Amino acid sequence: QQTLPVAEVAQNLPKKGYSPFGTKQSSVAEWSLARLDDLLNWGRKGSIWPLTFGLACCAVEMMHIAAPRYDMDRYGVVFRASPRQADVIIVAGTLTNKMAPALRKVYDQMPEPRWVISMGSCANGGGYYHYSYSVVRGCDRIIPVDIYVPGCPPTAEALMYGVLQLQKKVKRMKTLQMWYRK
Amino acid sequence: PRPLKTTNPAAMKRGTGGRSSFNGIVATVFGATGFVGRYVCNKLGKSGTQMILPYRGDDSDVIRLKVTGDLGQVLFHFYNLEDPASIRDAVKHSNVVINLVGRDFETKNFKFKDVHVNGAERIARIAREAGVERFIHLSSLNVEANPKDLYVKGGSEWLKSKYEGELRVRDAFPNATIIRPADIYGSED
Amino acid sequence: TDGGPLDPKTALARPEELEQRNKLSGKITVPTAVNLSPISGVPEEHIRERRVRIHIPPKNAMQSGTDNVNTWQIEFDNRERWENPLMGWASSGDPLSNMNVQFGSPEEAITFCERNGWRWYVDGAAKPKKERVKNYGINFAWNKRTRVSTK
Amino acid sequence: IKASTGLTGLAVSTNPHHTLSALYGKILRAVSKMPQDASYRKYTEQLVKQRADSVAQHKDITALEKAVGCGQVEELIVQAENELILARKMLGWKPWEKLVQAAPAKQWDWPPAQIMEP
Amino acid sequence: AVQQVRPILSVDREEARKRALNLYKAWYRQIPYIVMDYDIPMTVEQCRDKLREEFVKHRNVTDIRVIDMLVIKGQMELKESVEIWKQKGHIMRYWKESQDPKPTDFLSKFIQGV
Amino acid sequence: DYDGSMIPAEWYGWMHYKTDLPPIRDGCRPKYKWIADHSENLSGTKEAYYPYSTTPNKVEAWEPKA
Amino acid sequence: ALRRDVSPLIQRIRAFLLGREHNLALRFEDGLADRTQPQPEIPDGPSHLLSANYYCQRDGRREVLPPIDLVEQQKQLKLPTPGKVYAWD
Amino acid sequence: DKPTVRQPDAVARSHLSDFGRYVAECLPKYVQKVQLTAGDELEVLIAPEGVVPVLQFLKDHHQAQFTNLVDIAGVDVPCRKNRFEVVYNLLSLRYNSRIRVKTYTDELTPLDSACEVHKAANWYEREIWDMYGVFFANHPDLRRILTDYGFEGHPQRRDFPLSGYVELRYDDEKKRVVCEPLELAQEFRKFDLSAPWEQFPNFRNANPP
Amino acid sequence: HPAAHGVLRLVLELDGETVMRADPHIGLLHRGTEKLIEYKTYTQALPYFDRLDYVSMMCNEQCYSLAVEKLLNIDVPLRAKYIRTLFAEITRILNHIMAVGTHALDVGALTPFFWLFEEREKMMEFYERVSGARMHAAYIRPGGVSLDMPLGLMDDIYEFASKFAERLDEVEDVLTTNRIWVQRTEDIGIVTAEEALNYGFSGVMLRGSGIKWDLRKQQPYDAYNLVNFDVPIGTKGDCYDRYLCRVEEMRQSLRIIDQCLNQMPAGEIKTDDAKVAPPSRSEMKTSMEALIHHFKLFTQGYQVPPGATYTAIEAPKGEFGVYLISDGSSRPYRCKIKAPGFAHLAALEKIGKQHMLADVVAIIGTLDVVFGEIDR
Amino acid sequence: EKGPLSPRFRGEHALRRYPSGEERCIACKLCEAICPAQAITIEAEERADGSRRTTRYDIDMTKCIYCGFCQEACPVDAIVEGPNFEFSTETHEELLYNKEKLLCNGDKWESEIASNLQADHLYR
Amino acid sequence: RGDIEKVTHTGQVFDKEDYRNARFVNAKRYVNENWGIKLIEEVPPKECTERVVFCDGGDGPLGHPKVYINLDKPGNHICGYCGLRFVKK
Ligand SMILES: NC(=O)C1=CN([C@@H]2O[C@H](COP(=O)(O)OP(=O)(O)OC[C@H]3O[C@@H](n4cnc5c(N)ncnc54)[C@H](OP(=O)(O)O)[C@@H]3O)[C@@H](O)[C@H]2O)C=CC1
Ligand code: SF4
Ligand code: SF4
Ligand code: SF4
Ligand SMILES: [Zn+2]
């Protein structure tokens, strides 16, 4: 595994910079799109609206992320009810067969760009009920998953770390910069 | 009697055919994000195929295909159609290559010359170098050596490129299969 | 009975409804050889292909205890398994292969198998072990070969 | 008079002495119709006398409840309203008869599925 | 080899035959509503065949009690389909569309493997 | 790019209040030669993990050539 | 001094609003117990004795007997109630 | 004298024993057997027809007053001929006691619903029908309560595979979730947790024929 | 729908806004828990009960632990009782905060959710500090709890309790006497006493309507013998008094902790029997018998004598019972689990009849249904 | 700022090793047999030097429930639930740990695990 | 890259023609470098005088179960658990 740089070696490395695309763009047009691409990502990154799914006993720890101790809202994360206004879905709990068509539909109704987070073992791979006769073995069978948060339930910080991974994943989208090459 | 390319048991057909099975086919679907690709990829995923899905754009478009297959049976590989070093990486382990790359119109970076004839040739030429056993290509049904226009003064360029791309494919990969559809439909079409 | 009001439902019911209320109390006769395959919900494909082996679980040769072979059992055919492509686990599409049920006698086991439409075949019940003498004194015998050279 | 019963949806009873007396009177008539040897007839007939006399013996509901225990007078009525239903219903079932269904073999055996050696 | 038992719904095969036909009525009446209220590819004629095809599955059933149970379960689905509690996916579940044909001939199965 | 996962295991306990003693102020820390330097959680990266079976195949196929 | 709390004036104002003297919910290092504690010396059990401790007496599993049949165990050998009356009212 | 062994509650045992006999006289037609469990809990084994009568008797009789019906548990035992057993757990608030009533039924034979006596059994009976497949005659509207719509079979019978026969997946051709024959990446690994040496000798000779 | 808690599917029959019929379609969280238990050793099945009634974590274990003990016919040490009883109350205080916290959100009030979930966060540090998990402790076990409390925990348990009265008062000021709160609850969902008994009701639903019943008092099973506390009763059987009962239960539970913390003795944590409870690790490394028993208790588990039992407790939601059957093997033959909410939801058909959505949403909260209980 | 936690916290897994460097695990398979989720798969073989050891040790973190029974059953403390709780990935496959991944954690987290065991073993 | 062809201590590696290497084109193959077979081999044996000695893994309750070894034979003797070697001279 790639280990972190030592202090002395890191003592020379240049400051990272904010944009993951750097300021090394050859042309003006490319550079403007790169900077303009950051503006989109800065927007979507800032305000990520979950859907308030809350299926099973991960759902309780999905409340304590909104509790004052950790305060999801500090990061611009605001819970919402309608899937139209919701941007992210946190599938937290055991997605049984009876639910499975309902999650698919609710996910479909969510407008793009939509990212899915899988909370806990139940939604990751079927978890403790993996072999049950009425459990979908992981929600990735039904909807694409963008971040997997392990745990049972994941700690509140663990989910917070998951959300920040989604911000970083959002931060590095190349929606515009890849249109130029296309 | 066609020789068996490799006798390693791990690379042989196994199972009942469900998602956990294995066809012994390691496909590479160029242009899986398109309209046809959504349906080709899913049908492969049913059988148990392992597929590499190169994608030129942002991952968001192609991430939806991960549901089609099973764990470890779908892999994405960013690639640029012009760069052959990118393409070799995605075809150096495959038994089958499927070329669903094309466009109904031109772009600022890709004219019909670059996509249908030069691009498709590059995918086929690289495939032969790697040693892909099979290859599949798509082309229009009305494809002709020199198609005459009917209502638009320059409306036949798309077919001209398709015909020329068909030949170069057969030039680079002589045992390539060619399927010539006509007016495909059925959703997202 | 006693004065207390009569039930409106039975008191007002037409004679026809009381009659079918009687024969639904019924106690009709039906044959005892039945097949519950239609209602058991098994996929039809399994019922046609998979045999069931009535048998006593085999005693563990590496132990002397026996109270784990005091039952009859059913185990289905040993259908295919294969290496998992990703991690190499064992994989199978054989739900019934996981199965096991216990019974008191083969007659019950056959009765259960017939009632569910399974095809069955019984392993020969182990005959009760013949009596063995197992005397101690013969280990020290005057002219017989049973005399032990060790101790 | 009790201000409130203390239980939601249970109303204070006017003349509980009369209502109980009628109910116990009705029960003994329904029970009378049952065969004499029926053990149920012997018990309720014995019981209802012990409740019935206390209802007439005491004229103060608070004293009545102590004399009988077994809850408030309102509940005493609620109980009495049941054995009418039971006693009436049971004149139809005739439970005193012999066992309707002889038990099957091994139907109450635990642990199950063991070879039995004759 | 006969035994005394408690009937389920009917006392005679003729009554059982009578009940089963009613279940066919109610389904056959209901197909036009199911097509409208479910976003599914199948048409009325196709579905009306599926009703015929499956009532034929239980062709050899003889015991009245078994026929009663099939009609109890058969009726339960119809109420769950007369209502739209069953979702779009469940209705099409009667066709097994996803599962592709498995050849039956010996030579094809052998080549395909177990 | 600060992450919660950049904290090396030396200070990790002190940072989550598992102990009141920083690594400098405790001598119970080991210094084995096989310990590894810290690393981030590397996901969506060319340096990420990917599982693989750790057992060589068991059945050997007969070689006709020899 | 030791607590990061708002100025004296606001504390009076906050105290007035709540209608009661306020105890700060937030936990401070001084109130709690130290996170690195001495190690424990958990006591033994009643049956760590070195003698007269035969399992044949202490054990409970081997003392349970099958269900008792009430009707027969008389034959081989105020009205009754399930238990003691309670005033649930 | 020995702390580990649980101390039996004799006073509660004494009352249940006598009242256990009491039921046997009042309901000879139905009560097959009465037994006091090792947990000092009373069990009343009744014939299949005596469900509604016996339940009514316990709820309405002065001495019983088992007003509160707590549970209806179903137990599947393929060994027995009437494989399905149904257990009612009743509570008597006035007398502060619990009693159990058991009955047995076959795959097909219906079992008289007790919604009347205690209409708390509206859903419990629905569950039993769904999980095991025991039909309850005269029920208001019997219907599956737990399993999926159109789920075929009855999962909690011991003769039902643990993982079921069919999984679910999303098929982008059909734009809906589809059911396929089951296919597990890793099988359920059995473990043979069978002891070769009997440990509880008290039950070796129990239950003579 | 947010108020449905992601499981419930009420197929309402709306005549405007008033509900004429409610069909609680259940089973969206059926995970065949009770069939998996039939395949798992008794110890391997303990985590399943943390999942049932997932807001009352250590209360479900206690029900399972008590059941196995009755079949095993063993007794727990004195110290373990107090630890159990202490954590039963802490769980009860947790659960009622969720009920009050969740119920407030359904009505619309927001602050009580956050003012209480701040205390809830502190409480689940004690779970984390003894068991190692903030939820699903898997701490209570048939032989008694699995580890001794950490040194110095009890000081922090006191510190939380000493301040918890103030927190509950502030929420009470904003909620109890609020004119709007009363209107959203008063006379909504009336449960007459004779109706409740017939329905299998229990817990606050039973005591909401004036019935004096509490299993801790009637059928005590732990240190509840050795403590004294009151029981809240409601006369009107509506949502409002039931709400008051929950708040009052949180006061009394805070009283029990005052007695547990002072009366805790010093002694062993597990029952001595190493054939039911694993032996100490230090003894495993040293003595042959300890290693054999450790080996067998974990691979094969312990043998429970054949029999059946029904134990129940006063779980915060209601009466939580487990009808456990043992066939003499290492695995349970069948484990039926009473969900206190099962009876409660069966009665939703009538209680909320002739009411509109704002009332039905209120009723759903006061039924106090944590799904997973209802869906085994 | 983050935490607080306690030394008993159950998190990501890790195979420890002796101070010599030799792996502690001896493929006794108690952990596999007790795992409620059947999340553990072990295949053992007589090593070249003749020591009982694993050629395979896989944990399916999407099936584990972080119960902690594995670390209680291990007779040699080979498997432990390390302090780490920040290991969310972007792919399902990366959540299936094989022995090399588990061993790497046991080296990255060695210092902190050895400190938790010392401060906690007496209770356990 | 290098890691693809590296052979793990358990002795497994994908053949250069095996397709399963495809999974590593966008990821890495961590092969642990601290092979236990060599580190234990590095530690020298312990000379003893008594006829039988015990190894407990070195740290009592934090080590492995106490096992006793008999040193009568000439060859240095390995501990089953920890792999340490003992010898009498
Ligand atoms: N009606 C029909 O569809 C018929 C089929 N065909 C041919 O079948 C093929 C697939 O059909 P269809 O799905 O409808 O086509 P689509 O336009 O729907 O999708 C084409 C795919 O090829 C990719 N693509 C296009 N240009 C490039 C490029 N320069 N470099 C890399 N990728 C590129 C696209 O990737 P991305 O979108 O991410 O940029 C896309 O995934 C087409 O080539 C078509 O000519 C022929 C006659 C009729
Ligand atoms: S993963 Fe664990 S905590 Fe989350 S819902 Fe499943 S059992 Fe509950
Ligand atoms: S923590 Fe529990 S579920 Fe997870 S691997 Fe260990 S034993 Fe298995
Ligand atoms: S219990 Fe410990 S020693 Fe045994 S196989 Fe598991 S990790 Fe290895
Ligand atoms: Zn050693």
UniProtKB/TrEMBL annotation, chain B:
Report residue spans for region: Disordered. Answer: 1-16
| Occurrences of domain NAD-dependent epimerase/dehydratase (ranges) | 28-189
**Membrane-crossing segments per the record:** none
Q: Kindly state the subunit structure of this protein.
A: Complex I is composed of 45 different subunits. This a component of the hydrophobic protein fraction. Interacts with BLOC1S1. Interacts with SLC2A4. Interacts with CLOCK. Interacts with RAB5IF.
Family as reported in the entry's similarity comment: Belongs to the complex I NDUFA9 subunit family.
> What protein name does the entry list?
NADH dehydrogenase [ubiquinone] 1 alpha subcomplex subunit 9, mitochondrial
> Top-down, what is the taxonomic lineage of the species of origin?
Eukaryota, Metazoa, Ecdysozoa, Arthropoda, Hexapoda
Automatic annotation (TrEMBL), chain G:
Q: Which keywords annotate this record? A: Acetylation, Electron transport, Membrane, Mitochondrion, Mitochondrion inner membrane, Respiratory chain, Transport
Report the locations given in the UniProt record.
Answer: Mitochondrion inner membrane
Asked whether the keyword Electron transport is assigned, the reply is yes
Is Transport tagged as a keyword? yes
Domain of life from the UniProt record: Eukaryota
An example GO biological process term is: mitochondrial electron transport, NADH to ubiquinone
Q: How does it sit in the membrane?
A: Peripheral membrane protein
Annotated Pfam families: CI-B14_5a
InterPro entries reported for this sequence: NDUA7
User: Self-association or partners: how does it assemble?
Assistant: Complex I is composed of 45 different subunits.
The family this protein is said to belong to? Belongs to the complex I NDUFA7 subunit family.
Q: Please state what the protein is called.
A: NADH dehydrogenase [ubiquinone] 1 alpha subcomplex subunit 7
UniProtKB/TrEMBL annotation, chain I:
Molecular function GO terms recorded: NAD binding; NADH dehydrogenase (ubiquinone) activity; oxidoreductase activity, acting on NAD(P)H; quinone binding
Where in the numbering of this chain does the NADH-quinone oxidoreductase subunit D domain appear?
106-376
Q: What are the protein's UniProt keywords?
A: NAD, Oxidoreductase, Translocase, Transport
Per the record, residues carrying Symmetric dimethylarginine are 31
Kindly list the GO CC terms recorded for this protein: mitochondrial inner membrane; mitochondrion; respiratory chain complex I
Q: Which domain of life is it from?
A: Eukaryota
Q: Which GO terms describe its biological process?
A: mitochondrial electron transport, NADH to ubiquinone
Q: Which family does it belong to?
A: Belongs to the complex I 49 kDa subunit family.
The entry's protein name is: Complex I-49kD
Q: Which organism is it from?
A: Drosophila melanogaster
Automatic annotation (TrEMBL), chain K:
Q: What portion of the full-length protein is represented by this chain?
A: 33 to 121 of 126
- Every Zinc finger CHCC-type domain range: 51-86
Q: Where does the protein principally reside? A: mitochondrion
Membrane topology reported for the UniProt record: Peripheral membrane protein
Q: Name one GO cellular component term.
A: respiratory chain complex I
TM regions (residue ranges): none
Q: What is this protein called?
A: NADH dehydrogenase [ubiquinone] iron-sulfur protein 6, mitochondrial
Q: Has keyword ATP-binding?
A: no
Q: Which UniProt keywords apply?
A: Electron transport, Membrane, Metal-binding, Mitochondrion, Mitochondrion inner membrane, Respiratory chain, Transit peptide, Transport, Zinc
Would the keyword Transit peptide turn up in this protein's UniProt record? yes
Where along the chain is Zn(2+) bound? Answer: 55, 64, 79, 82
Q: What does this protein do?
A: Accessory subunit of the mitochondrial membrane respiratory chain NADH dehydrogenase (Complex I), that is believed not to be involved in catalysis. Complex I functions in the transfer of electrons from NADH to the respiratory chain. The immediate electron acceptor for the enzyme is believed to be ubiquinone.
Q: Which organism is it from?
A: Drosophila melanogaster (Fruit fly)
In its UniProt record, which GO terms are filed under biological process?
mitochondrial electron transport, NADH to ubiquinone; respiratory electron transport chain
